[PDB]
Design a protein around this motif. Structure first.
Motif, PDB file in Angstrom:
ATOM      1  N   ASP A   1       0.860  -1.230   0.000  1.00  0.00           N
ATOM      2  CA  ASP A   1       0.000   0.000   0.000  1.00  0.00           C
ATOM      3  C   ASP A   1       0.877   1.255   0.000  1.00  0.00           C
ATOM      4  OD1 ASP A   1      -1.973  -1.989   0.508  1.00  0.00           O
ATOM      5  OD2 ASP A   1      -3.047  -0.654   1.937  1.00  0.00           O
ATOM      6  N   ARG A   2       1.976   1.202   0.736  1.00  0.00           N
ATOM      7  CA  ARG A   2       2.858   2.391   0.925  1.00  0.00           C
ATOM      8  C   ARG A   2       3.288   2.976  -0.414  1.00  0.00           C
ATOM      9  NH1 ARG A   2       5.553   3.919   5.288  1.00  0.00           N
ATOM     10  NH2 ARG A   2       7.565   3.896   4.267  1.00  0.00           N
ATOM     11  N   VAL A   3       3.409   2.184  -1.480  1.00  0.00           N
ATOM     12  CA  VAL A   3       3.763   2.697  -2.802  1.00  0.00           C
ATOM     13  C   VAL A   3       2.883   3.898  -3.144  1.00  0.00           C
ATOM     14  CG1 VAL A   3       3.845   2.069  -5.301  1.00  0.00           C
ATOM     15  CG2 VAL A   3       4.741   0.512  -3.561  1.00  0.00           C
ATOM     16  N   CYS A   4       1.608   3.833  -2.811  1.00  0.00           N
ATOM     17  CA  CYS A   4       0.702   4.984  -2.964  1.00  0.00           C
ATOM     18  C   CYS A   4       0.659   5.825  -1.686  1.00  0.00           C
ATOM     19  CB  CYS A   4      -0.725   4.576  -3.326  1.00  0.00           C
ATOM     20  SG  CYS A   4      -0.927   3.443  -4.737  1.00  0.00           S
ATOM     21  N   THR A   5       0.403   5.258  -0.527  1.00  0.00           N
ATOM     22  CA  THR A   5      -0.021   6.004   0.660  1.00  0.00           C
ATOM     23  C   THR A   5       1.124   6.785   1.297  1.00  0.00           C
ATOM     24  OG1 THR A   5       0.270   4.165   2.129  1.00  0.00           O
ATOM     25  CG2 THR A   5      -1.902   4.416   1.104  1.00  0.00           C
ATOM     26  N   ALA A   6       2.327   6.305   1.260  1.00  0.00           N
ATOM     27  CA  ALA A   6       3.512   6.946   1.876  1.00  0.00           C
ATOM     28  C   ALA A   6       4.390   7.585   0.813  1.00  0.00           C
ATOM     29  CB  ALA A   6       4.332   5.925   2.620  1.00  0.00           C
ATOM     30  N   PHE A   7       4.672   6.892  -0.276  1.00  0.00           N
ATOM     31  CA  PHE A   7       5.590   7.350  -1.318  1.00  0.00           C
ATOM     32  C   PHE A   7       4.954   8.201  -2.394  1.00  0.00           C
ATOM     33  CE2 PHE A   7       7.737   3.402   0.228  1.00  0.00           C
ATOM     34  CZ  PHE A   7       8.807   4.024   0.843  1.00  0.00           C
ATOM     35  N   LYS A   8       3.604   8.163  -2.522  1.00  0.00           N
ATOM     36  CA  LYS A   8       2.882   8.963  -3.528  1.00  0.00           C
ATOM     37  C   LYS A   8       3.323   8.667  -4.940  1.00  0.00           C
ATOM     38  CE  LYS A   8       1.241  12.976  -2.443  1.00  0.00           C
ATOM     39  NZ  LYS A   8       1.422  14.412  -2.266  1.00  0.00           N
TER      40      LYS A   8
ATOM     41  N   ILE B   1      -7.168   3.556  -3.018  1.00  0.00           N
ATOM     42  CA  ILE B   1      -5.843   3.080  -3.421  1.00  0.00           C
ATOM     43  C   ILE B   1      -5.896   2.560  -4.847  1.00  0.00           C
ATOM     44  CG2 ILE B   1      -6.001   0.811  -2.280  1.00  0.00           C
ATOM     45  CD1 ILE B   1      -3.065   1.308  -1.490  1.00  0.00           C
ATOM     46  N   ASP B   2      -4.895   2.895  -5.642  1.00  0.00           N
ATOM     47  CA  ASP B   2      -4.732   2.399  -7.016  1.00  0.00           C
ATOM     48  C   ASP B   2      -4.070   1.013  -6.968  1.00  0.00           C
ATOM     49  OD1 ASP B   2      -4.326   1.832  -9.690  1.00  0.00           O
ATOM     50  OD2 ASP B   2      -3.748   3.961 -10.150  1.00  0.00           O
ATOM     51  N   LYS B   3      -4.876  -0.009  -6.759  1.00  0.00           N
ATOM     52  CA  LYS B   3      -4.351  -1.385  -6.531  1.00  0.00           C
ATOM     53  C   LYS B   3      -3.617  -1.847  -7.758  1.00  0.00           C
ATOM     54  CE  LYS B   3      -7.957  -2.780  -3.289  1.00  0.00           C
ATOM     55  NZ  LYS B   3      -9.084  -3.721  -3.110  1.00  0.00           N
ATOM     56  N   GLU B   4      -4.077  -1.508  -8.971  1.00  0.00           N
ATOM     57  CA  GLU B   4      -3.358  -1.880 -10.210  1.00  0.00           C
ATOM     58  C   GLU B   4      -1.957  -1.277 -10.213  1.00  0.00           C
ATOM     59  OE1 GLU B   4      -5.816  -1.241 -13.715  1.00  0.00           O
ATOM     60  OE2 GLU B   4      -7.143  -2.920 -13.137  1.00  0.00           O
ATOM     61  N   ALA B   5      -1.866   0.025  -9.915  1.00  0.00           N
ATOM     62  CA  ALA B   5      -0.560   0.700  -9.959  1.00  0.00           C
ATOM     63  C   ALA B   5       0.398   0.052  -8.944  1.00  0.00           C
ATOM     64  CB  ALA B   5      -0.724   2.164  -9.687  1.00  0.00           C
ATOM     65  N   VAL B   6      -0.084  -0.303  -7.759  1.00  0.00           N
ATOM     66  CA  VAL B   6       0.797  -0.945  -6.769  1.00  0.00           C
ATOM     67  C   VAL B   6       1.359  -2.231  -7.372  1.00  0.00           C
ATOM     68  CG1 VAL B   6       0.868  -2.086  -4.502  1.00  0.00           C
ATOM     69  CG2 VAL B   6      -0.370   0.074  -4.784  1.00  0.00           C
TER      70      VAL B   6
ATOM     71  N   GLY C   1      -2.048  -4.877   4.333  1.00  0.00           N
ATOM     72  CA  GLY C   1      -2.349  -3.849   3.351  1.00  0.00           C
ATOM     73  C   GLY C   1      -3.726  -4.054   2.750  1.00  0.00           C
ATOM     74  N   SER C   2      -3.869  -3.703   1.510  1.00  0.00           N
ATOM     75  CA  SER C   2      -5.136  -3.747   0.786  1.00  0.00           C
ATOM     76  C   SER C   2      -5.205  -4.924  -0.206  1.00  0.00           C
ATOM     77  CB  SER C   2      -5.374  -2.454   0.061  1.00  0.00           C
ATOM     78  OG  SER C   2      -5.461  -1.416   1.000  1.00  0.00           O
ATOM     79  N   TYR C   3      -4.241  -5.844  -0.189  1.00  0.00           N
ATOM     80  CA  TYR C   3      -4.285  -7.045  -1.055  1.00  0.00           C
ATOM     81  C   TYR C   3      -4.427  -6.624  -2.503  1.00  0.00           C
ATOM     82  CZ  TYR C   3      -4.607  -9.036   3.583  1.00  0.00           C
ATOM     83  OH  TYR C   3      -4.328  -9.301   4.894  1.00  0.00           O
ATOM     84  N   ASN C   4      -3.534  -5.718  -2.898  1.00  0.00           N
ATOM     85  CA  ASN C   4      -3.464  -5.104  -4.227  1.00  0.00           C
ATOM     86  C   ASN C   4      -3.313  -6.142  -5.339  1.00  0.00           C
ATOM     87  OD1 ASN C   4      -3.269  -2.080  -3.434  1.00  0.00           O
ATOM     88  ND2 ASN C   4      -1.746  -3.113  -2.149  1.00  0.00           N
ATOM     89  N   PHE C   5      -2.619  -7.260  -5.038  1.00  0.00           N
ATOM     90  CA  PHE C   5      -2.361  -8.311  -6.029  1.00  0.00           C
ATOM     91  C   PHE C   5      -3.649  -9.018  -6.462  1.00  0.00           C
ATOM     92  CE2 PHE C   5       2.382  -9.766  -5.492  1.00  0.00           C
ATOM     93  CZ  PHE C   5       2.831  -8.509  -5.744  1.00  0.00           C
ATOM     94  N   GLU C   6      -4.769  -8.802  -5.809  1.00  0.00           N
ATOM     95  CA  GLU C   6      -6.065  -9.336  -6.344  1.00  0.00           C
ATOM     96  C   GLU C   6      -6.344  -8.802  -7.747  1.00  0.00           C
ATOM     97  OE1 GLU C   6      -9.086  -8.864  -3.324  1.00  0.00           O
ATOM     98  OE2 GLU C   6      -8.412 -10.737  -2.331  1.00  0.00           O
ATOM     99  N   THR C   7      -5.683  -7.715  -8.152  1.00  0.00           N
ATOM    100  CA  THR C   7      -5.770  -7.170  -9.517  1.00  0.00           C
ATOM    101  C   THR C   7      -5.023  -7.978 -10.587  1.00  0.00           C
ATOM    102  OG1 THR C   7      -3.935  -5.587  -9.268  1.00  0.00           O
ATOM    103  CG2 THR C   7      -6.166  -4.812  -8.681  1.00  0.00           C
ATOM    104  N   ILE C   8      -4.213  -8.976 -10.187  1.00  0.00           N
ATOM    105  CA  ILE C   8      -3.407  -9.702 -11.180  1.00  0.00           C
ATOM    106  C   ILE C   8      -4.282 -10.273 -12.301  1.00  0.00           C
ATOM    107  CG2 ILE C   8      -2.108 -11.843 -11.459  1.00  0.00           C
ATOM    108  CD1 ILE C   8      -0.647 -11.180  -8.824  1.00  0.00           C
TER     109      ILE C   8
END
Ligand SMILES: OC[C@H]1O[C@@H](O)[C@H](O)[C@@H](O)[C@@H]1O[C@@H]1O[C@H](CO[C@H]2OC[C@@H](O)[C@H](O)[C@H]2O)[C@@H](O[C@@H]2O[C@H](CO[C@H]3OC[C@@H](O)[C@H](O)[C@H]3O)[C@@H](O[C@@H]3O[C@H](CO[C@H]4OC[C@@H](O)[C@H](O)[C@H]4O)[C@@H](O)[C@H](O)[C@H]3O)[C@H](O)[C@H]2O)[C@H](O)[C@H]1O
Ligand SMILES: OC[C@H]1O[C@@H](O)[C@H](O)[C@@H](O)[C@@H]1O[C@@H]1O[C@H](CO[C@H]2OC[C@@H](O)[C@H](O)[C@H]2O)[C@@H](O[C@@H]2O[C@H](CO[C@H]3OC[C@@H](O)[C@H](O)[C@H]3O)[C@@H](O[C@@H]3O[C@H](CO[C@H]4OC[C@@H](O)[C@H](O)[C@H]4O)[C@@H](O)[C@H](O)[C@H]3O)[C@H](O)[C@H]2O)[C@H](O)[C@H]1O
Ligand SMILES: *[C@@H]1O[C@H](CO)[C@@H](O[C@@H]2O[C@H](CO)[C@@H](O)[C@H](O)[C@H]2NC(C)=O)[C@H](O)[C@H]1NC(C)=O
Ligand SMILES: *[C@@H]1O[C@H](CO)[C@@H](O[C@@H]2O[C@H](CO)[C@@H](O)[C@H](O)[C@H]2NC(C)=O)[C@H](O)[C@H]1NC(C)=O
Ligand SMILES: O[C@@H]1[C@@H](O)[C@H](O)O[C@H](CO[C@H]2OC[C@@H](O)[C@H](O)[C@H]2O)[C@H]1O
Ligand SMILES: O[C@@H]1[C@@H](O)[C@H](O)O[C@H](CO[C@H]2OC[C@@H](O)[C@H](O)[C@H]2O)[C@H]1O
Ligand SMILES: *[C@@H]1O[C@H](CO)[C@@H](O)[C@H](O)[C@H]1NC(C)=O
Ligand SMILES: *[C@@H]1O[C@H](CO)[C@@H](O)[C@H](O)[C@H]1NC(C)=O
Ligand SMILES: *[C@@H]1O[C@H](CO)[C@@H](O)[C@H](O)[C@H]1NC(C)=O
Ligand SMILES: *[C@@H]1O[C@H](CO)[C@@H](O)[C@H](O)[C@H]1NC(C)=O
Ligand SMILES: *[C@@H]1O[C@H](CO)[C@@H](O)[C@H](O)[C@H]1NC(C)=O
Ligand SMILES: *[C@@H]1O[C@H](CO)[C@@H](O)[C@H](O)[C@H]1NC(C)=O
Ligand SMILES: *[C@@H]1O[C@H](CO)[C@@H](O)[C@H](O)[C@H]1NC(C)=O
Ligand SMILES: *[C@@H]1O[C@H](CO)[C@@H](O)[C@H](O)[C@H]1NC(C)=O
Ligand SMILES: *[C@@H]1O[C@H](CO)[C@@H](O)[C@H](O)[C@H]1NC(C)=O
Ligand SMILES: *[C@@H]1O[C@H](CO)[C@@H](O)[C@H](O)[C@H]1NC(C)=O
Ligand SMILES: *[C@@H]1O[C@H](CO)[C@@H](O)[C@H](O)[C@H]1NC(C)=O
Ligand SMILES: *[C@@H]1O[C@H](CO)[C@@H](O)[C@H](O)[C@H]1NC(C)=O
Ligand SMILES: [Ca+2]
Ligand SMILES: [Ca+2]
Lengths: 755, 755
Positions: free
Chosen positions: A281-288, A295-300, A316-323
């Motif tokens: 998640d931090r790729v978006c939430t901390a690092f911008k 959250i942009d789960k695809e971008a993560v 986190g938000s289980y961003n990899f569900e976008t795979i």
């Protein structure tokens, strides 16, 4: 007609290829996302929820976390339910990795608690640490765990950061040796280690948990990567965890250069990398680097998976569900998914999981495997070997078992001063200093106890009682320091001075602790101070104003017995500091391996205790030199070193140089143990290098009056630098070999020349 | 038949080619080594030594230093002797560059002393700074100087380092704007500037002078290089000085990547680089890249000259004397020497030196050029504009000229609190706070003075007198802070808290200063504290326990008049901080432009003045947020901002976005001056970037009740980042524009989008 991946005799790469070709895209996604036992196990009652296990196995079934403070049978039973579900109710039956913490003991109640890492690194005894790790793996595997989230091979290079205690100190070589041994001990059980936190994590800006790190590629390769390479490549770790930070502005979880170019293309690492918890998640939430809300789960997923971060941890938000959507849209190459899955499967095959999916012992054997006397004895032995004697004036120590002894201070009794990564309510079990001292003396000495103060308060209302205890005694032992919290209290927010997410802007004793010491010294009773802590404390007036000064980094469950062993002379203290101690937080950083041109500049000023000012330049009113350097530790004995001898003076990159030195124990009566340390100086270099580097050591027991020949090998290939083209080279020229009792206390030297 | 290089009408490159082809190898060596006026001028008597001038011109004749505390005619006469010797007694008559310091005034006795750089950066008035630099160049050129060793475009990113005062603060944009203006003002005289210290110098490890710097290439390009690019390329500086440090293990004096690949191949810099003083020797003596004893002069020369460091400064071993032997042995390509010499000659031709070798005024004109009323008036004006109001409770300020006023403290009188880079005995001339306050009130108020304490002592024997002064007064002004030393006392070792080679491990007030303030507050007399200093001081209890708090970084010679102008309301304070103030030295670093993921983590703890502890996490018992942020400063007036408007919302890299905001002065009666600041946020990036960056500002005078439309341009080309391939890009996407009164006090915002 039977699937080739099920055949134990087929080469692992053929098994991986066969299994991968049978998997659906959803089954591939599921191997790359971490689940949680609480998805099917009620943490309070142990009650099973099949619907929860079905979902968790479908969506995040490759591995799951089990680090909850529950009874042993909750873990064993609900792990078995998961492995049984996989075998009976999935097509492919891919066994789960079952993960917990192991840092300084298996994270479950009533398992063996060893001293914290920063402390056992002071043992300079990697073989004893390997035995500890073998016993931690015995305990974990008893309940069906097959993966532990350690070792930490980060370096303690920012002393304000709360996780110093979790490291093996500030030195790449010592941390790499300990990480190699720890990894080997765990994996001797066919349990996977998880080397963390890759890479460059533990120098956060301002000392703050997860803050970014400033540094260049030469520093990363020279200082940060070596301990990782020893634990990962030489010990064959089956997994790695990437870190929370950015390093020169590239998130560790999304760094293709480190995770792919170095780790795979240079080193040849064969296995998988997981993110840290919520690190995706931090790729978006901390690092911008993408939209945070929502959250942009695809971008993560597009940032971290192609970088070489194979597995998304929970938290986190289980961003990899976008795979599934990303592959179906043509945004993510299936080959990137296939490579990630292949890495996870390769480890699971090599571990033996397809042949042995559930490694738990039966319930009738748990008390023969967990918290055994062998493990408790080792806890005491390793803790005892980790204690560092800082000062001992006029033979104050060891103490006699006679007369009266005052035992004073917040850390002497009432709670066990454990480091972080212990289970909830651990602090109510173990041997305190008071317990160990009372046991040691029996009816031969009177023990006068007083708390003196609470660690978390400046209240001095307890001082009069402690002064009375001291005045009625022949000697006073005062126990103070820092404190942490267990895996429920730490995250609930209870007060602490160290541990994950507990960072400090001062290293001085907190609260009434320093004034308590002063009150006891002022009685004129000889006062022995024990620092019970997770990192350096800055109180330089203790060195010459106390009778003795002892460092015990956060204890084992045998801590007070180990401490009494040293205080009464049954064991001659042998520890050496794994981390340098500064005079003040204003002097940081303080590591011993500074680059040439650092630290040794100009003249230091001073502030006298009466307030007189003595002005200098580096600093105007202070001193950038260490109070106590890396590798420092005294003994009740004294050691005399002979001439340093090398077996070879003219060598190639291919050679090993063996350093020999005779060491004599010159004590009149007492055996002692010395850690002979070998520092290498690259006398002339093409780029600026560390001023000196530990490159070997040997801990040797020497009877009184005896001389032992100590031999330490130096692999010349290991003595190189990263040149201006960022290539690793051992440059022809002189290498100084400095041999001694600390990084500063050099007792002899020799030179060899590379051709 | 006459040499082409003597023809003023011939293109400079043809002049360079013609002269270079006439030079011997010794004459080439001589252009690359810095001499010293004391080689022919006795510093005590002024007596001339021809033999010394002959040698100096032969071996190190390209340029020479004149920074000695001697009478004006010693400099003018002995510079003339050198230029006359060159014309009459050398073949080629290559005019000398004549170098001194200019940091905050021409370094000679009885010249105009401006406030220190860290202070005049708080003016946010680059046009006023350009006028100062034009007057410094007028003064220097009067005596025959044609080169000054400034500006410093280093950033104040390590607050322990003694040279913070010499910088224009922590921000790349503000430092670049001021460095551009300063360079332009100096060079308007055809005197050369010398942009220093290239590059990345002022974040030394531990804060120690000359210690190495940790950092990556993205940090170097993003933060360190921009101020250099503005002063060097945009203002056309004729010279640069490389630095003392290493950056990720490459010495700045020997860095081909920075000195050649970036500076020449990327930027197209046309002129020359000098080392810093003794920076050449350090290649061996500090960095250990060669034998130190005896120094390997060949190795030094082979490291630095081919890297792009053209000129060797004095203060070392004059290693470049080896150039003749190295070229004759085939170890050094003559083309490398020819390139270095060409760079020096190119600047000398462009400056006009071959047509005007000696630019001194006659003696009868020196008092019409040096220390003019125009320059003294500007000193007062710029100092006044640099003063920062930190607190003002219940209209304590401005003071009335009536009643009784106590003036207390070590910095109120008895010496002038000048910064470093002033001549010996400067501190005995100038307007002190007491002098300025007494002049301001005349016979309308009674002034009660007491020293209170010595800055260098914890002695409190002066407190009773100061408490008596306060008790008999209506208000008390207490003046405390830091101190430096002049160019003889600093190097003789006299006590100091700031300046070159004076680094600190604490930012708290030294000695009896803080206890003195507490004694005066405790009288119940309203107490106004003035911090007179060279860097932040950490005393957060001052904000709410004093009546008012004023920052005056090290003053001009008009310092007390500028301070009285503000204190009595004749000028409404308008300064804004150029550097962030932390709560404690344990909280560093504190710059406002931290990368996303830094600083804003968790909850802060606190220690109450009664000793109660309030535990947090970042930090356990402290706060990583700034006490006062970059860009902070109050007014006697109040400002209300309207809606932020952009002229364009959809732009290219090629475009300029003009930000417009209406600002109203809402005060009932007083005109005030606001510095409207524009911060840009790159909302989504491909690499981690600074959380926000100053990218424009405008200082605007607004009468009471009036509304002014403020317009600030943003060049979109300037808003990019250094991507994962280390390429500079302005990425398509959203840019936030934050407008306000400090880096934290944001009053409005707007968004534009790059296509
Ligand atoms: O919701 C806020 C608050 O509510 C209260 O009611 C409650 O008391 C708190 O628990 C709670 O906070 C969250 O608590 C958990 C731990 O919870 C225990 O306490 C309650 C008990 O009833 C329960 O049984 C327990 O689970 C915290 O967990 C820790 O998370 C950190 C990472 O989170 C922190 O660090 C990064 C920063 O970005 C975050 O903001 C910060 O909170 C771990 O740090 C990494 O963790 C891995 C281990 O991961 C494993 O545990 C976490 C889990 O999500 C993941 O799936 C697992 O694999 C280590 O190996 C790494 O070395 C380390 O860097 C901690 O280990 C973990 O215990 C939550 O952070 C918190 O929000
Ligand atoms: O020998 C020790 C001691 O003896 C005593 O008797 C005496 O009182 C001391 O002066 C002396 O120390 C040396 O003093 C000089 C300054 O001398 C003045 O005081 C005595 C007067 O009688 C006399 O007229 C004066 O000259 C110091 O000079 C300063 O040097 C620093 C660099 O040196 C320091 O920093 C680096 C570190 O590695 C060194 O160890 C440390 O001492 C300058 O720093 C750079 O300088 C340039 C300016 O250079 C110009 O001056 C120096 C000269 O060699 C060169 O040729 C010139 O171009 C700046 O522009 C840069 O910004 C800066 O980084 C100081 O400016 C300089 O004044 C000697 O360092 C010291 O050893
Ligand atoms: C730090 O945490 C401890 C708990 O570990 C707090 O202790 C409780 O304090 C109250 C009143 O202060 C007592 O009545 C309880 O008995 C305490 N518990 C224990 C186990 O001692 C302590 O208050 C906290 N201190 C701060 C300053 O936050
Ligand atoms: C700091 O330097 C000052 C000189 O600037 C020293 O002051 C001298 O001190 C002696 C006795 O302390 C006095 O008799 C002189 O009159 C002082 N001179 C001045 C100008 O005040 C001071 O002693 C130094 N302090 C320290 C602590 O080094
Ligand atoms: O008590 C032992 C001595 O028997 C041994 O001879 O020296 C040791 C080291 O003591 C030095 O280092 C620590 C300081 O505190 C002492 O004052 C020194 O003599 C002792 O532990
Ligand atoms: O005195 C002026 C006021 O006239 C103006 O209205 O507000 C200013 C800012 O004062 C605030 O900031 C500084 C703090 O110290 C105050 O307590 C605040 O009101 C004043 O200077
Ligand atoms: C776990 O069990 C208890 C009931 O005894 C319950 O209060 C809690 O809600 C249960 N947890 C979940 C998430 O169902
Ligand atoms: C059982 O798990 C399912 C699926 O996750 C969940 O929806 C349901 O709420 C759970 N029931 C309990 C009692 O926890
Ligand atoms: C498999 O799933 C069925 C329900 O569909 C259930 O009855 C059975 O218990 C499951 N078996 C295991 C081992 O999970
Ligand atoms: C344990 O791991 C090793 C290394 O991959 C493997 O050779 C061995 O068969 C494994 N043992 C078991 C019982 O699975
Ligand atoms: C304590 O005493 C010895 C004096 O022999 C000295 O080496 C050491 O620096 C002193 N330590 C401190 C912290 O003052
Ligand atoms: C303080 O101690 C120092 C060092 O022993 C001594 O020089 C000084 O005289 C003492 N100061 C006072 C004020 O007593
Ligand atoms: C400068 O002049 C004085 C003589 O008045 C002398 O003492 C000093 O030696 C001279 N300096 C040099 C270097 O000759
Ligand atoms: C004059 O200069 C020469 C050459 O540098 C030197 O040898 C001689 O000592 C100098 N004489 C004086 C009086 O300084
Ligand atoms: C040139 O040198 C000669 C000595 O060789 C000397 O007499 C003359 O004064 C010098 N002229 C100048 C201008 O230096
Ligand atoms: C001053 O410098 C400029 C820029 O090189 C040049 O054009 C001009 O001729 C110079 N002026 C003098 C008088 O030399
Ligand atoms: C001073 O007071 C104000 C309370 O309104 C607060 O914003 C500020 O944080 C306080 N400053 C300090 C340093 O405590
Ligand atoms: C100290 O101040 C705090 C904050 O106002 C208050 O809560 C606490 O009671 C005071 N402590 C004492 C011991 O007076
Ligand atoms: Ca070498
Ligand atoms: Ca963007």
């Amino acid at each position: 007609e039977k699937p080739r991946y099920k055949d134990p005799s087929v080469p692992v790469e053929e098994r991986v290829t066969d299994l991968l070709g049978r998997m659906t895209l959803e089954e591939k996604m599921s191997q790359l996302i971490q689940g949680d036992i609480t998805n099917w196990m009620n943490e309070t009652t142990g009650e099973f929820n099949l619907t929860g296990l079905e979902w968790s196995t479908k969506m995040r079934g490759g591995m799951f976390y089990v680090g909850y403070p529950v009874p042993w049978d909750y873990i064993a039973d609900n792990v078995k339910k998961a492995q049984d579900y996989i075998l009976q109710n999935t097509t492919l039956g891919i066994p789960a990795i079952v993960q917990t913490e192991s840092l300084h003991g298996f994270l479950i109640g009533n398992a063996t608690i060893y001293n914290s890492p920063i402390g056992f690194a002071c043992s300079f005894n990697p073989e004893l640490i390997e035995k500890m790790a073998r016993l931690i793996g015995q305990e974990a595997s008893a309940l069906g765990v097959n993966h532990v989230m350690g070792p930490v091979v980060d370096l303690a290079r920012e002393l304000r950061f709360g996780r110093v205690e979790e490291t093996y100190g500030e030195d790449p070589f010592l941390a790499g040796e300990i990480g190699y041994h720890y990894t080997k001990g765990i994996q001797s059980h066919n349990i996977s280690a998880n080397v963390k936190h890759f890479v460059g994590f533990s120098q956060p800006e301002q000392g703050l948990n997860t803050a970014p790190v400033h540094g260049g590629e030469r520093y990363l390769r020279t200082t940060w990567l070596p301990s990782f390479k020893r634990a990962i490549m030489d010990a064959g770790a089956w997994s790695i965890m990437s870190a929370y930070h950015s390093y020169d502005g590239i998130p560790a979880v999304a760094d293709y250069h480190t995770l792919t170019e170095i780790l795979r293309e240079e080193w040849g690492y064969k296995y998988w990398v997981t993110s840290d918890a919520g690190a995706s998640d931090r790729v978006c939430t901390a690092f911008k680097l993408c939209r945070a809300d929502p959250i942009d789960k695809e971008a993560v997923t597009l940032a971290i998976l192609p970088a070489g971060n194979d597995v998304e941890m929970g938290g986190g938000s289980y961003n990899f569900e976008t795979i599934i959507d990303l592959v179906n849209a043509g945004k993510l190459d299936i080959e990137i998914v296939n490579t990630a899955v292949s890495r996870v499967l390769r480890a699971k095959f090599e571990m033996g999981l397809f042949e042995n999916p559930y490694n738990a012992a039966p319930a009738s054997e748990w008390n023969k495997l967990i918290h055994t006397q062998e493990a408790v004895d080792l806890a005491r032995e390793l803790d005892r070997e980790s204690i560092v004697l800082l000062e001992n004036h006029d033979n104050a120590l060891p103490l006699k078992k006679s007369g009266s002894i005052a035992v004073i201070g917040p850390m002497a009794h009432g709670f066990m001063n454990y480091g972080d990564y212990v289970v909830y309510e651990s602090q109510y079990r173990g041997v305190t200093p008071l317990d160990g001292i009372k046991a040691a003396v029996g009816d031969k000495a009177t023990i006068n106890y007083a708390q003196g103060c609470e660690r978390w308060s400046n209240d001095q209302s307890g001082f009069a009682e402690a002064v009375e205890a001291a005045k009625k005694s022949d000697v006073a032992v005062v126990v103070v320091g820092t404190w942490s919290r267990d895996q429920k209290e730490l995250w609930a927010g209870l007060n602490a001075t160290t541990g994950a997410h507990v960072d400090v802007n001062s290293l001085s004793l907190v609260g009434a602790q320093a004034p308590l010491i002063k009150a006891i010294i002022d009685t004129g009773v000889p006062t022995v101070v024990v620092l019970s802590s997770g990192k350096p404390i800055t109180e330089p007036w203790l060195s010459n104003n106390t009778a003795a000064l002892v460092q015990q980094f956060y204890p084992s469950e045998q801590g007070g017995n180990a401490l009494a062993d040293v205080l009464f002379g049954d064991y001659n203290p042998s520890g050496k500091l794994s981390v340098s101690f500064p005079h003040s937080v204003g002097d940081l950083p303080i590591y011993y391996d500074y680059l040439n041109s650092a630290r040794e500049i100009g003249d230091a000023g001073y502030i006298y205790s009466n307030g007189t000012l003595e002005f200098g330049h580096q600093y105007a009113l202070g001193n950038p030199k260490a109070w106590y350097p890396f590798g420092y530790g005294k003994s009740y004995s004294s050691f005399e070193y002979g001439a340093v001898k090398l077996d070879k003076t003219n060598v190639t990159e291919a050679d090993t140089v063996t350093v020999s030195v005779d060491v004599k124990n010159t004590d009149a009566t007492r055996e002692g143990t010395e850690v002979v340390q070998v520092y290498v100086v690259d006398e002339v270099a093409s780029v600026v290098v560390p001023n000196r580097l530990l490159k070997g050591f040997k801990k040797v027991v020497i009877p009184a009056g005896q001389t032992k020949t100590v031999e330490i090998p130096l692999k010349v290939q290991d003595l190189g630098l990263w040149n201006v083209r960022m290539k690793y080279v051992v440059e022809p020229g002189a290498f100084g070999v400095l041999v001694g009792s600390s990084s500063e206390d050099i007792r002899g030297n020799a030179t060899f020349y590379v051709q």
